[PDB]
Amino acid sequence: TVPVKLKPGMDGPKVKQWPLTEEKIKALVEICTEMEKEGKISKIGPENPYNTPVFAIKKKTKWRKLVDFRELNKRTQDHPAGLKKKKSVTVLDVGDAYFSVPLDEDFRKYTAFTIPSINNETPGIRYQYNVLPQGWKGSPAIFQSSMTKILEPFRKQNPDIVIYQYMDDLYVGSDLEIGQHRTKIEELRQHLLRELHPDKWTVQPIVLPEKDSWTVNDIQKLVGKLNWASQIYPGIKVRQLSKLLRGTKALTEVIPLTEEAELELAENREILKEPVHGVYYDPSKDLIAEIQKQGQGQWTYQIYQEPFKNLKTGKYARMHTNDVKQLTEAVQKITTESIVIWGKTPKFKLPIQKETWETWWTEYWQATWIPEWEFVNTPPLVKLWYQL
Amino acid sequence: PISPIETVPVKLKPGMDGPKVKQWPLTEEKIKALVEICTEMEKEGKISKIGPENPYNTPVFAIKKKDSTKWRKLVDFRELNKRTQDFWEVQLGIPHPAGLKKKKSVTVLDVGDAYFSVPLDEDFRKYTAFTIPIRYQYNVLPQGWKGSPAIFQSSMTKILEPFRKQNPDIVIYQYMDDLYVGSDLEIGQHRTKIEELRQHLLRWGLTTPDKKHQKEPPFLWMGYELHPDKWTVQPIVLPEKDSWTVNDICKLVGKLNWASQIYPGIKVRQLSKLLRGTKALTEVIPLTEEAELELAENREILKEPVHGVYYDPSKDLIAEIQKQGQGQWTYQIYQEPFKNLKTGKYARMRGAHTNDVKQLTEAVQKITTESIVIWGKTPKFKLPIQKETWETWWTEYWQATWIPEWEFVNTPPLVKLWYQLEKEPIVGAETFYVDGAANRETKLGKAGYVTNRGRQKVVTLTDTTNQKTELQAIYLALQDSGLEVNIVTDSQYALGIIQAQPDQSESELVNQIIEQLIKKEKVYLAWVPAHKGIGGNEQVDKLVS
DNA sequence: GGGCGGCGCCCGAACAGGGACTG
DNA sequence: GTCCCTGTTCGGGCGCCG
Ligand SMILES: Nc1nc(=O)n([C@@H]2CS[C@H](COP(=O)(O)OP(=O)(O)OP(=O)(O)O)O2)cc1F
Ligand SMILES: [Mg+2]
Ligand SMILES: [Mg+2]
């Protein structure tokens, strides 16, 4: 094995386990019985002071155990540009390959987790890992050499195919037709015994209303929106539009746009088409992803690292709906895009109450990773700024 | 005897040693109890005599057990607890009788001298030194040490594991040493299985004395009385004093909270409000008239007989919620119409400003989590809120909010939003431009408005803030306007507060604003960026400055 | 009379994040 | 930045169980 240490001056995770439903607990009990009978995990006691929450997800009657290693990954010692330009990209779960490499003995105490019981019939049953656990930052790092030795022949025989690895997944991108793309994916699945479309992702720009008649209210709202947007695009000018609002007028009074204000509005429409200047991706800083609920199944999002220096802006437009489910789906979509583009997941500012999210988010999760997030009492102003 | 189970290896915190506390004086009766206990335990090898090679010590004492004349031996291990490593507790919660399923046969038994049967790590025994007014050390788990509950619970789980494997269809609710054992066997086969379980435990050094072997209902378990088809809570005696201290209030509120699991309608908010800023426990707190009435209502509802039923997994879980004032809610979880699994309250005040839809959503979340714990699934909800009210709220609310499968119930008081902000400006409504300024040095401020019809007003304020002056300006516009009004505000603080449609607030100013808003017919609230020369916000800004 | 752990409730203290402000 | 406001978490009291 290889020795793995924590970051200097940091202890292991001590995160309490959250309530699980009966089906998840049963799936976890079966999976852990198999893993224990195969030597992957071992029962432990309370003299280990560490813990990491665990749950399960059902994709497409086969359950998958998912361990929330966010804290442990955060406390553990420390990219193809063409992947985002491929016609088709398939995601493949390769986590099982980690169960063949043993884990450093002194590190195993940090991977502890606790299976709960319905109605607290029984105290929590605690395990620790004996092998590279799925969802841990160290697993792809320590397995990298074996993975490269595995994937060398398939890359040689297919130089135009882009295979990139994030924690538990291989992203395989090709430019050829669907049907042959699935054939190459099946060939790679054969080789591993030793559906996205990134070129269609679009940016959602800021757009100004088009009217034949403008009230004092319309112009005040437009001026506020442009004053906000000028923090991102310094070319935005507001003087001539604000001229039309001198005095103390009624909100429903109709204001005719002068030639100066019309030209200024056209210039501002043109300026909002150019890309933001001076936005450089910092690998040492975190990706911040903000989401706004626009209503009627619409969601806007921005990915940035510094204020007003957006790396990306986009939307997720669903159509008796469920806000929490749509929000988790939007989070997973944004995270997939961020992984494909920059090879890293963003920290989310979620417009939802903490308890609602933590109560219902695991019922709609389908990915093998979990991003960091925090909860926001969002302002309606920024919600109006990115409206469509 | 002593369990032949392997010990759990514990260690002191790095760079620390064992405690050296001196024994405090004890009553001769306590001394006799302790010497009898210690002679008995030393004969069995649970404690070992030590000598001068042991430099540590920790005080001991004894209390009266729940039984008639038995004494429990305790050690004030607070120092050793400070010096001892951290553990991860394995007790994740408390089992509830509403989560039990119907069993043909039930037994309740209790392990005798539970802690004193589980061995202690040899290397650690040194630190458990004590003196009976003879010095000893512990070879088993002592009572008073912080690592004893978790070590015992884990050891008990390991001991029961082979029996649970061999008997997957015998259900064993294992709270610390109390075991509830349920089966679908006839009574004879059930007693045979119980004897098998007792012999299994005895093989692992855990006796099950007959004096605590319950074989017929009602079973006393976890503070409940379990009958075949029903369960009740052992009686709750609420204090009936004439003078009320803070400690008495805490005891009464705790008893009422414990009662609310099966008694519907319990309310504690007005009694809890009596505990703001009180210094110590002995502080006498005269009861408020509202607190008096709340206590009287609770006392009356506690006089009625009530019981629960057990869980049938082949039927739906239904949680029905009812509203009372002051931000308080009750709920009943049942499967058959008038047969409650359990009941509960919810009274948390989340945030400086809120309304009843937010509180209903929060109560739904709490009930959902509690139900996931107790039954492992989410219930179907009956809520006193129109589908149209919820549609409006979650359509117009900027946050992601969702209620699981629910249906409307016709029981007042219905949950409603008390006013609606317009989406568009109002024709024929006077347009108020409001603003407030505050001096961060003198704390003096001004609030005021101008209107498109020529009116302007400015109010001076003392000991205020910028946010407060903005709220005051909005309030002044609401006061001096007609039934329909357009208001253009400077402050996204006040706009964000009002757009959430609060009906209740801890701020008196926001409460007055809410009153005004409810009185109005149409309100449209718009925002403009400050200090940008946008009329007539320009005029108000110049005025209040 | 006290010691221990779990869960619950409520309240206050400490701390974090964001917006408005001076000059 | 400072001041103000709001939200979270954690620790203290009590209750319940062992
Ligand atoms: N107040 C208590 N403090 C404790 O530390 N305990 C611990 C945790 S559970 C364990 C039970 O111990 P025992 O079996 O010796 O005592 P018991 O009265 O529960 O039963 P029994 O007299 O041995 O039949 O003692 C129990 C208490 F009630
Ligand atoms: Mg006992
Ligand atoms: Mg202002």
In degrees rounded to 5, what are phi and psi of residue B240? Answer: -130, 45
**Does the beta-carbon distance from A293 to B398 stay under 8 Å?**
yes
**Cα separation, B522 vs A126, whole angstroms:** 59
The one-letter code for the residue type at B252 is L
Number of the ligand 1 atom closest to the C-alpha atom of B144: 5
B447: which strand partners? Answer: B436, B459
Strand order in the sheet with B105-110: B105-110, B178-183, B171-174
Helix (H) or strand (E) holding B309, with range, is strand B308-309
User: Which residues does a gap of C–N over 2.5 Å follow in chain A?
Assistant: 60, 78, 194, 319
Alpha-carbon dihedral sign for residues B482, B488, B494, B499: positive
Amino acid at the residue B14: P
Spanning CA of A122 to C1' of D16, the rounded length in angstroms is: 18
A173 CB-near residues (< 8 Å, 6+ apart)? A82, A83, A86, A87, A88, A89, A161, A162, A163, A164, A198
Task: Give B67's contacts (C-beta < 8 A, 6+ positions apart).
Answer: none
Dihedrals phi, psi of B95, to nearest 5 degrees: -65, 150
Give the residue with minimal CA–C1' separation from D12.
B280
Contacts of A330 in chain B (CB under 8 A): none
The position carrying tokens 């020529």 is B454
Which ligand is the nearest neighbour of the Cα of B147?
Answer: 1
Q: Under a CB-based contact definition with an 8 Å cutoff, are residues A26 and A96 in contact?
A: no
Strands A347-350 and A288-295: parallel
Indicate the fold that domain B91-115+149-217 takes in CATH: Alpha-Beta Plaits (3.30.70)
Reduced to 3 states (helix: H, G, I; strand: E, B; else coil), residue A16 is coil
Using CA atoms, how far residue B429 sits from B129, B423, B449, B482, B521, in Å, is 83, 14, 15, 8, 11
Q: How far is CA B23 from CA A266, B48, B50, B54, in A?
A: 88, 18, 16, 15
- What class has domain B419-544? alpha beta
Helix, strand or coil, per DSSP, at residue B55: coil
CATH class of B218-311: alpha beta
What are the φ and ψ backbone dihedral angles of B503, each rounded to 5 degrees? Answer: -105, -15
Quick one: which of B315, B317, B314 has its CA closest to B382? B317
Cβ within 8 Å, pair B157-A125: yes
- CA dist B430 and A146 (Å) reads 74
Length of chain A measured in residues? 388
Contact B478, B499 (CB under 8 A): no
| Element of type H or E holding B30 | helix B28-43
User: For strand D, is any atom closer than 7 Å to the CB of B221?
Assistant: yes
Total length of chain B:
545
Instruction: Please report which helix (H) or strand (E) contains residue B509, including its range.
Output: helix B508-519
Residue in B94, B373, B398 closest to A378 by CB: B398
Q: Does B17 show up as a binding residue in the annotation?
A: no
Method: X-ray
- Which residues of chain A from 243 to 272 reach within 8 Å of chain B, CB to CB? 245-252
CB A315 within 8 A of CB A301: yes
Query: From atom 7 of ligand 1, which residue's Cα is the shortest distance away?
Result: B143
Largest CA distance in chain A: 80
Max Cα–Cα distance, chain B, nearest Å: 99
To the nearest 10°, report the CA torsion of B500, B501, B504, B506. Answer: 40
Q: Tokens in use for B421?
A: 């902000």
The answer to whether the beta carbon of residue B223 comes closer than 7 angstroms to any atom of strand D is: yes
Q: Which positions ≥6 away from B44 have C-beta within 8 Å?
A: B1, B2
Interface touch A223/B534, C-beta < 8 Å: yes
Closest of A371, A321, A322 to residue A350, by C-alpha: A371
Q: Which of B490, B494, B498, B488 is nearest to B452 (CA)?
A: B488
Q: Which domains does chain A have, with CATH numbers?
A: 1-77+99-139 (3.10.10.10), 82-98+140-195 (3.30.70.270), 196-281 (3.30.70.270), 282-385 (3.30.70.270)
Q: Quick check: B531 CB within 7 A of strand C?
A: yes
What's the distance, Cα to Cα, between the start and end of chain B in Å? 84
Residue nearest to nucleotide D18 (CA to C1'): B176
Q: Looking at CA atoms only, how far is residue B464 from chain A in angstroms?
A: 24
C-alpha torsion B30→B31→B35→B37, nearest 10: 10
Could you count the other beta carbons within 10 Å of the beta carbon of residue B93? 15
Three-state secondary structure call for residue A140: helix
Residue list, ligand 1 pocket, CB within 6 Å:
B 65, 70, 110-115, 143, 176-177, 212
For B:481-500, CB contacts with A below 8 A are 486, 488, 492, 495-496, 499
- Which nucleotide shows the minimum CA-to-C1' distance to residue A355? D8
Q: What is the dihedral of CA B153, B154, B155, B160, to 10 degrees?
A: 90
Ligand 3 centroid–CA B491 distance in Å is 6
By the CB < 8 Å criterion, does B171 face chain A? yes
Name which of A22, A221, A248 is nearest B451 (Cβ-Cβ).
A248
Alpha-carbon distance A102 to A119, whole Å? 35
Residue B251, CB, strand D, below 7 Å:
yes
- DSSP state letter for A39: T
Residue B245 CB in 7 A reach of strand D: no
A window 120-139, beta carbon within 8 A of B: 120-126
Interatomic distance A224 CA / C19 C1' (Å)? 16
**Residue A169 phi, psi dihedral angles, 5° rounding:** -125, 145
Name the class of domain B1-90+116-148: alpha beta
Q: Where are the domains of chain B?
A: 1-90+116-148, 91-115+149-217, 218-311, 312-418, 419-544
Give which of B152, B534, B538, B543 to mutate to test A binding, by max A Cβ within 10 Å.
B534
CA-based nearest distance A44→chain B, Å: 9
Residue nearest D16, CA–C1′ metric: B258
Resolution of this entry, Å: 2.5
Distance in Å, CA B59 to ligand 1 centroid: 19
What is the spatial distance between Cα B210 and Cα B194, in angstroms, rounded to a whole number? 12
B318 — alpha (psi -120 to 50), left (phi > 0) or beta?
Answer: beta
CB contact under 8 A, A119 and B433: no
The beta-carbon contacts of B333-340 under 8 Å, at least 24 apart in sequence, are B333/B98, B333/B367, B333/B371, B333/B379, B334/B309, B335/B309, B335/B311, B336/B309, B339/B309, B340/B262, B340/B264, B340/B308, B340/B309
With a CB cutoff of 8 Å and minimum separation 6, the contacts of B241 are B248
Separation of alpha carbons A191 and A184, rounded Å: 10
Residue A19 per-residue DSSP state: P
Chain A interface disruption, residue of B399, B432, B452, B523, most A CBs within 10 A: B399
Tell me if B60 sits within 8 A of B34, measured CB to CB.
yes
Distance A5 CA to C7 C1' (A): 35
Q: What is the Cα Rg of chain B in Å?
A: 32
Q: Which atom of ligand 1 is nearest to the CA of B114?
A: 14
Q: What is the DSSP letter of B396?
A: H
Distance between CA A376 and CA B8 in Å, rounded? 44
- C-alpha B434 to ligand 2 mean position (Å): 70
Candidate of B115, B210, B213, B221 to mutate for ligand 1, largest count of ligand atoms within 8 Å of Cβ: B115
* Ramachandran area for residue B333 (φ above 0: left; ψ -120 to 50: alpha; else beta): beta
- Asked whether B167 and B160 are in contact (CB, 8 A), the reply is no
Nearest CA to B71 out of B27, B19, B129, B24 is that of: B27
Q: Give the relative orientation of helices B537-544 and B466-479 as an angle to the nearest 10 degrees.
A: 120
Which residue from A minimizes the CA distance to B86? A49
Q: How far is the CA of B206 from the centre of ligand 2 (A)?
A: 10
What is the distance in A from the centroid of ligand 3 to the CA of A230?
20
CA angle B221, B227, B229 (to 5 degrees): 130
Say how many Å lie between the CA of residue B73 and the centre of ligand 1.
Answer: 10
B54 Cβ under 8 Å from any chain A Cβ: no
DSSP percent split of chain B into helix, strand, coil, nearest 5:
35, 25, 45
Please indicate if the annotation marks B67 as binding a ligand. Answer: no
Phi and psi (nearest 5°) for B432? -100, 125
Q: Give the CATH number of domain B312-418; options: 2.30.30.100, 3.40.720.10, 3.90.1150.10, 3.30.70.270.
A: 3.30.70.270
Joined together, the tokens standing for residue B301 give 């509802």
Contact A42, A128 (CB under 8 A): yes
Q: Which of A14, A44, A47 is the mutation pick for testing B, counting most B CBs within 10 A?
A: A47
Nearest residue to nucleotide C11, by CA–C1' distance, is: B276
| Bridge partner list, B383 | B408
Instruction: Give the pairing of strands A88-93 and A125-129.
Output: unpaired
CA A357 to chain CA mean position, Å: 15
Is B184 assigned a ligand-binding role in the annotation?
no
> How far is Cα A24 from Cα A87, in angstroms, rounded to an integer?
36
Q: Do B402 and A356 touch (CB under 8 A)?
A: yes
Are B72 and B65 spatial neighbours (Cβ–Cβ below 8 Å)? yes
**Burial of B327 per CB tally in 10 Å (0-12, 13-18, 19+):** buried
